[PDB]
Design a protein around this nucleic acid. Structure first.
Ligand SMILES: [K+]
Ligand SMILES: [K+]
Ligand SMILES: [Mg+2]
Ligand SMILES: [Mg+2]
Ligand SMILES: [Mg+2]
Ligand SMILES: [Mg+2]
Ligand SMILES: [Mg+2]
Ligand SMILES: [Mg+2]
Ligand SMILES: [Mg+2]
Ligand SMILES: [Mg+2]
Ligand SMILES: [Mg+2]
Ligand SMILES: [Mg+2]
Ligand SMILES: [Mg+2]
Ligand SMILES: [Mg+2]
Ligand SMILES: [Mg+2]
Ligand SMILES: [Mg+2]
Ligand SMILES: [Mg+2]
Ligand SMILES: [Mg+2]
Ligand SMILES: [Mg+2]
Ligand SMILES: [Mg+2]
Ligand SMILES: [Mg+2]
Ligand SMILES: [Mg+2]
Ligand SMILES: [Mg+2]
Ligand SMILES: [Mg+2]
Ligand SMILES: [Mg+2]
Ligand SMILES: [Mg+2]
Ligand SMILES: [Mg+2]
Ligand SMILES: [Mg+2]
Ligand SMILES: [Mg+2]
Ligand SMILES: [Mg+2]
Ligand SMILES: [Mg+2]
Ligand SMILES: [Mg+2]
Ligand SMILES: [Mg+2]
Ligand SMILES: [Mg+2]
Ligand SMILES: [Mg+2]
Ligand SMILES: [Mg+2]
Ligand SMILES: [Mg+2]
Ligand SMILES: [Mg+2]
Lengths: 118, 97, 205, 152, 51, 244, 124
RNA sequence: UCUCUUACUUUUAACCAGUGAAAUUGACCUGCCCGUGAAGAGGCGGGCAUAACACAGCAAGACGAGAAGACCCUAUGGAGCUUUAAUUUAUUAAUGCAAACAGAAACCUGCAUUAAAAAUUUCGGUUGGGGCG
RNA sequence: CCUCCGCAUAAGCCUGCGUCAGAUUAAAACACUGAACUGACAAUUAACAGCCCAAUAUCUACAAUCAACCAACAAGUCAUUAUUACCCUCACUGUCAACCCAACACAGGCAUGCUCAUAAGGAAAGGUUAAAAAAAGUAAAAGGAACUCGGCAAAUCUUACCCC
RNA sequence: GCUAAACCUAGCCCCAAACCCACUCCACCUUACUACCAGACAACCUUAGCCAAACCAUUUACCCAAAUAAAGUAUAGGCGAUAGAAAUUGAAACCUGGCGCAAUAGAUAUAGUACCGCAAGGGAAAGAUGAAAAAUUAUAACCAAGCAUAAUAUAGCAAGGACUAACCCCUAUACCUUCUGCAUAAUGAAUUAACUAGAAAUAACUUUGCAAGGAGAGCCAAAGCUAAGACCCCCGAAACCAGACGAGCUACCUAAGAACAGCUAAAAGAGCACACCCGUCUAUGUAGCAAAAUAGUGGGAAGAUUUAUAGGUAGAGGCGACAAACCUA
């Protein structure tokens, strides 16, 4: 391509233009309504027991009449409690490894560079 | 094959670092401190091993009744199986009766 | 975009070049070189700043810095600590020998005071205006950051507007007047589009 | 627009209007012979032929008569060093026929004459290699491999 | 049985380093003489004639 | 590694943060309580020490409650704390015989009762224990109010307590609106169970129902920043005029 | 032998599967009896393209421009620049009341507006 | 088909060129006879024979190779199945009583008795080829 | 010279013998243009097909088989009206290939519509020699089951009987 | 001198401390990752068995919220294998560590990816120059088996005694394991490298301390008591139980479809005979083309037929023109 950087400049310009227009609308929405999100939503447990942010959709009939919406379950049954602990402990092992590994790097790094301590 | 062709990197050990020059200090805290402290209280490590000694089965049994409620589900299940196996090994297998 | 392995080793060739791909294929895994941690604020070596070589083949010689690598704390000086390699070699031609510079660690170079061309240590301080500057430990004098050409290479002092370049008088003119209307509402007023039909309420869930 | 929530429409509702569109089309040269009025574009999946018809007339003021689109599958055969299949993204190819009998031919964006520099260009590194290569000569067979540097 | 050789090297040009780089090659000597000198014919005879 | 807290303490840790910590203080105390229910399917010892006939020594004795299984159908009636007993038995009452599974179920009756506070008749499923306890309490309304939560063992029974307590607190005229004298007479018979309406509104609710109830009290559309900034601007302008 | 780790698209499956699965394009109508598709004009997004004649701005900006610091817009900054001068002027005059908030520009409700703010009923 | 086989073509085969497996393998510089031996010897004893060496055939030997083979026996090792093996009726069904009712009954529940259909577990050793221990 | 194959659809598969370039170089041989390998680029354009149906009541005894005879049982594969509501219109998706399931470029498995021998699709022989043994096929004097557990194979195109 | 061999990091393990993550846009319970229509659909229910009792049938340890001590005591128990308290006593507590691992190790992890299986599920392998690759004129020598350099000369567990001399002479029945006894024609081993198998202190003994007392609460003591040292392996079943996943093969069923030339006959679970289905006999093949095929010969081929598609029945079971058949080789 003759000038590949030209595309990057326009894409940066397009994203900057989109940020400015979006920011102005967001500032006005907080003034008139105070809502921080332009799309309605709520925090609901899924079938897997984890807290998720469910983004609402547009419907013509109320939710108590929707055939397809009512099949979707937003509650966790008791048998998911054990799996939640298992997944939490899995992250704890991952978190522990990261914390312990960083300390190992520092201890080794002072052996070859003692001036770091001094 | 199976043996290195070069010498290992040289290792220099500081015989007078902070830890070695102060190793064994306060081991006579009870004798020289009017028995206010005990040398076993200077042990640092697992809460179920400070000032206590036993075989593998006794360590597993003691660990389960002290930190068993804090262990992970996988670790707790492994500990329970280890106790079951060690119970069968020591009380049913061996050369002497 | 940028695709760097977790233990990618930076070298003289910039990342993403054709030579870098051959030198560092995505599958290879080498021992990560130990790098002394240096804060970005603590770093005091910049391009275009003359430094003296403390250790090397030719120590005590001062040369301008053309490139710096923060990842490995590397300093490149033109005309100093350079080996010789054949460039443009083919099957029939032996090649042309050119001097190729070698990187220098930050501890292998030492900044020199502008007044006295001697090695010295510098410490970061502040001026009266509040701008951060570096002050030498001995014979404290201000050493400003030398001017260096930009990465892209555009010279603002030799810049001519093109056919699709906004003029400065139009890129700085303020046309925005704050109000309580969205862009969608404002455009219809300017364009003149009228929509008398109303939007019926819907259910969100 | 893509990656946006389209407001739902009900009977007698307001006209759906888009003021800023994120659709980007690129004109491509057809790989096979096509009619003169036929023009080929690459459009995002979220774009339809009805949107494309209003896209060209709305923005470029290009009258279009017939629009036909097809979805092209991207080959997933490529595998990397980890034996993981590399997926080439699928793209939608749109064929546009001009309305008022206009004929469109894809221009040559890289003319050979323009590529050749009429003005003199003298690279510093290139000059060093060229001059030394021409000055240096092949070893004379009659010299039998004896170095020619020595004048003795 | 799916293992293969690591044949993935391709030939690249060493004529020019990667472009759009601030660093440039520093050269100490020129390629050729700026103005070629042609010694006068018969200088060998003048070698004997030192005066 | 190890968890900071034991697993059985995580339930009470969830009451320290989130919407649970914002629940009323009196309601939170009722959940943490683990009061022992009244024995039903076993006879308590009655004493703390007894003399073992074998060795003639004063040994300590403890009452070990028998686990009770309450079917979900028991939450729509007043079983009096009875329920299914899931246990084992020995054939022919011989320890050397094989062990078999045995389930004991209470005898259920769909009796009808009348509540004076609510002025309504209910057709509920009850056992003989509930019938006896109501007679010992001298009325259904007394039985509901006197019996604690761990002894009622019925979600519907807890809802009746909440309904009755609100009428004893609000002094609701809906109870015989045409009989002012009769209305006061009923409320003077249950005056000993008066509870403030603030605390009587959370009685019997489960943890899940309390969370939703508290969420509704905290649910409101956010105030627009325009209204907030108007107060800030005027307040600053008022102080500005004072300096002038 | 099926590749379960591949993106499921409309190109896979029998005729019923291929016709029901799409690519993400929003519908612009509905199917009537006899499989006859009815297109709604109001469901087709109509592009509001302005006139670009005599437009000062250009896609690029000349390098001879100041490096002004970035000042992201906020609700408080927008309120002070637009609404505050109107309120301050009326406050000095002495005729100010909360009832006239709609006069300053405040919108108590978003209903009855072509462009609602929450939830928004317009495209980008 | 045979007395009684024979001829020919094709594939295979063998040779030249290309590509290139598998079971197998303690180490072998790997002979015959007689004898001996854990009872069937290339290896021990006594005789005989014996330059090295590849290719093509053959199938007597290497108790040839291939799945701890089939076949009998062993185990206080398993499982299926059958039953007048032992241990049970939890469960199911039918009655009885208590309970609970109306004024009689049913449903339900508890405790029993009958079966039904199942559940758990085991199959003592010694001796005896034509027996009825 | 073969063709018991072919073409298309359905299902399945998912770019998998199109172009260009390659230090290229292993598809069970070959290979420079080498290429069923790698990189890059190109592509299959809807009329066919898929994706349908405003509500409430009310309607639908008499097969099919050339449906006309006849003859059945196994008794069958196809229908609306009334009133109200209703007038915007051609979107979306599938479209390639020598292809799929059998660990393989596997002598196997594989639905329907046409062609019933092709107008389509192919190649049994790497070269040589013409030993044994082995597989397949053909021919045979005189005899014709003498072979063998047995007319098994092969030739031929047979008769009669018993058991179940 | 080839193949190779070496080369230290990635990262991990065990503790301590501290209570952890989860809204860029869009999509995602229908066939998930699919903008957009009238629903009613609901969670809760003793674990069992292996195993030990040398069978087995009652029984047989499983954190339940303070270490130690009371104490393996009271009790429980085919009073037997074994199980087992309480009153009471009261504890210190400083995260930033290692007589942990170093690419067959340490997590499986370069990754739950490649790959395998319909699914549940199983589950890898490997990397190595240098300050500089913008020094490849590069990261020199030597090292397993395997080869090459360099085929072989009577005779024999291949060696030993020897010898001027390789052989020739003389002497010599491989190893391990299992058995009374193996050169045994009994087991295992082609070979190289790495990995791979004896854990417990009651008593007694030995060596110190103190001593009618010993011990840093409890416990023992008629020379004992305290402390240390020093004794108790690896691989392999067929099974059993619990909870899941499977009827895309097959067994049968349901829904709505499709196929069956020609001839003879008659309104046939008829005859001959293609497609099609089936697999009688023989041969080839036997790590094959094929974890059941090829060639020829056969049975049926308008029906209790064949077949595509979707759905159903799931192991204490299904299903079955009962073959103990079939339910993913
Ligand atoms: K043989
Ligand atoms: K395919
Ligand atoms: Mg299309
Ligand atoms: Mg050959
Ligand atoms: Mg092999
Ligand atoms: Mg020999
Ligand atoms: Mg012999
Ligand atoms: Mg002999
Ligand atoms: Mg031979
Ligand atoms: Mg043979
Ligand atoms: Mg025995
Ligand atoms: Mg049992
Ligand atoms: Mg159509
Ligand atoms: Mg040949
Ligand atoms: Mg003849
Ligand atoms: Mg004979
Ligand atoms: Mg005969
Ligand atoms: Mg005969
Ligand atoms: Mg025959
Ligand atoms: Mg729709
Ligand atoms: Mg709809
Ligand atoms: Mg046992
Ligand atoms: Mg047994
Ligand atoms: Mg590993
Ligand atoms: Mg060697
Ligand atoms: Mg000899
Ligand atoms: Mg089961
Ligand atoms: Mg089926
Ligand atoms: Mg016919
Ligand atoms: Mg027939
Ligand atoms: Mg059949
Ligand atoms: Mg037969
Ligand atoms: Mg067949
Ligand atoms: Mg027939
Ligand atoms: Mg099914
Ligand atoms: Mg059948
Ligand atoms: Mg039978
Ligand atoms: Mg049988």
């Amino acid at each position: 391509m003759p000038s590949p950087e030209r595309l990057d400049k326009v894409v940066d310009s397009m994203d900057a233009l989109d940020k400015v227009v979006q920011e102005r609308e967001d500032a006005l929405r907080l003034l008139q309504t105070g809502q921080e999100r332009a799309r309605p939503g709520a925090w609901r447990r899924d079938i897997f027991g984890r807290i998720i942010w469910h983004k609402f959709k547009q419907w013509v009939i109320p939710w108590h009449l929707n055939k397809r919406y009512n099949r979707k379950r937003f509650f966790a049954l008791p048998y998911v409690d054990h799996f939640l602990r298992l997944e939490r402990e899995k992250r704890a092992r991952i978190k522990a490894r990261k914390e312990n590994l960083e300390r190992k790097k520092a201890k080794i790094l002072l052996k070859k560079f003692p001036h770091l301590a001094e | 094959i199976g043996i290195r062709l070069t010498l290992p990197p040289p290792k220099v050990v500081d015989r007078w670092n902070e830890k070695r020059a102060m190793f064994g200090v306060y081991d006579n805290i009870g004798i020289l401190g009017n028995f206010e402290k005990h040398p076993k209280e200077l042990i640092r490590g697992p809460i179920w091993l400070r000032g206590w000694k036993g075989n593998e089965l006794q360590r597993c049994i003691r660990k389960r009744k002290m930190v068993g409620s804090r262990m992970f589900a996988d670790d707790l299940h492994n500990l329970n199986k280890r106790i079951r196996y060690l119970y069968k090994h020591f009380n049913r297998h061996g050369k002497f009766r | 975009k940028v695709t760097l392995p977790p233990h990618y080793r930076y070298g003289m060739s910039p990342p993403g070049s054709v030579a870098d791909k051959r030198k560092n294929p995505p599958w290879i895994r080498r021992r990560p070189v130990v790098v002394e941690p240096i804060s970005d604020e603590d770093w005091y070596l910049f391009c275009g700043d003359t430094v003296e070589i403390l250790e090397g083949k030719d120590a005590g010689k001062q040369g301008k810095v053309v490139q710096v690598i923060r990842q490995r704390n590397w300093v490149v000086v033109g005309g100093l600590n350079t080996h010789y390699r054949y460039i443009g070699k083919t099957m029939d031609y032996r090649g042309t020998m050119i001097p190729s510079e070698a990187p220098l660690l930050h501890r292998q170079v030492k900044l020199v005071d502008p007044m006295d061309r001697k090695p010295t240590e510098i410490e970061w301080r502040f001026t009266e205006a509040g701008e951060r500057v570096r002050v030498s430990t001995r014979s404290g004098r201000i050493i400003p950051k030398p001017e260096f050409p930009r990465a892209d290479g555009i010279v603002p002092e030799t810049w001519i507007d093109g056919p699709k370049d906004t003029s400065v008088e139009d890129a700085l003119e303020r046309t925005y007047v704050p109000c309580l209307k969205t862009l969608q509402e404002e455009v219809m007023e300017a364009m003149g589009i009228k929509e008398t039909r109303k939007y019926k309420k819907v259910y969100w869930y | 627009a893509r990656n946006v929530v389209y407001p739902l429409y009900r009977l007698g509702g307001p006209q759906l209007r888009v003021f800023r569109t994120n659709f980007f089309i690129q004109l491509v040269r057809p790989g096979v012979a096509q009619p003169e009025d036929t023009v080929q574009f690459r459009i995002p999946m979220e774009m339809t032929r009805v949107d494309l018809r209003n896209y060209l007339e709305g923005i470029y003021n290009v009258p279009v008569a017939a629009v036909r689109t097809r979805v092209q599958h991207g080959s997933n055969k490529r595998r990397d060093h980890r034996n993981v299949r590399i997926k080439k993204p699928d793209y939608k190819v749109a064929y546009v026929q001009l309305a008022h009998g206009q004929t469109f031919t894809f221009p040559d964006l890289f003319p050979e004459k323009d590529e050749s520099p009429e003005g003199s260009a003298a690279d510093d590194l290139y000059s060093m290699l060229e001059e030394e290569r021409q000055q240096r000569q092949s070893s004379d067979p009659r010299r039998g491999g004896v170095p020619s540097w020595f004048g003795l | 049985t799916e293992k293969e050789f690591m044949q993935h090297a391709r030939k690249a040009g060493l004529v020019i380093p990667p472009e759009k780089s601030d660093r440039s090659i520093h050269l100490a000597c020129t390629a050729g003489i700026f103005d070629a000198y042609v010694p006068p014919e018969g200088d060998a005879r003048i070698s004997s004639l030192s005066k | 590694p190890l968890h900071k807290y034991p697993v059985w303490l995580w339930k009470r840790l969830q009451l320290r943060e989130g919407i649970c910590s914002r629940l009323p203080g009196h309601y939170l105390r009722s959940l943490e309580e683990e009061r022992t229910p009244t024995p039903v399917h076993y006879r308590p010892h009655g004493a703390k020490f007894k003399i073992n006939p074998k060795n003639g020594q004063r040994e300590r004795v403890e009452d070990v409650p028998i686990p009770i299984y309450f079917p979900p159908e028991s939450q729509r009636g007043l079983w009096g704390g009875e329920g299914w007993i899931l246990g084992q038995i020995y054939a022919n009452n011989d320890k050397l015989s094989k062990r078999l599974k045995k389930v004991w179920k209470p005898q259920l009756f769909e009796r009808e009762f009348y509540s004076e506070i609510l002025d309504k008749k209910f057709t509920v499923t009850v056992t003989m224990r509930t019938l006896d306890l109501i007679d010992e309490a001298y009325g259904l309304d007394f039985y509901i109010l006197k019996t604690p939560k761990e002894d009622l063992c019925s979600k519907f029974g807890m809802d009746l307590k909440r309904g009755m307590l609100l009428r004893l607190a609000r002094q609701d005229p809906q109870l015989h609106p045409e009989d002012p004298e009769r209305r006061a007479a009923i409320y003077d018979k249950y005056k000993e169970f008066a509870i403030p309406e603030e605390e009587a509104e959370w009685v019997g609710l489960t943890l899940e129902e309390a969370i939703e109830k508290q969420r509704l009290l905290e649910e409101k559309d956010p105030v627009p920043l325009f209204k907030i900034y108007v107060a800030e601007l005027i307040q600053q302008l008022q102080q500005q005029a004072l300096s002038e | 032998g099926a590749d379960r780790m591949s993106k499921w698209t409309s190109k896979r499956g029998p005729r019923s599967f291929r016709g029901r699965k799409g690519r993400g394009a929003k519908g612009i109508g509905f199917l009537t009896s006899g499989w006859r598709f009815v297109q709604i004009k109001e469901m087709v997004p109509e592009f509001v393209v302005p006139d670009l004649t005599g437009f000062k701005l250009k896609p690029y900006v000349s390098y001879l421009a100041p490096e002004s610091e970035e000042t992201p817009l906020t609700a408080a900054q927008l309120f002070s620049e637009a609404v505050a001068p109107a309120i301050e002027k009326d406050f000095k005059d002495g005729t100010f009341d909360p009832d006239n908030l709609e006069k300053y520009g405040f919108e108590p409700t978003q209903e009855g507006k072509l462009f609602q703010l929450y939830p928004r009923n317009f495209l980008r």
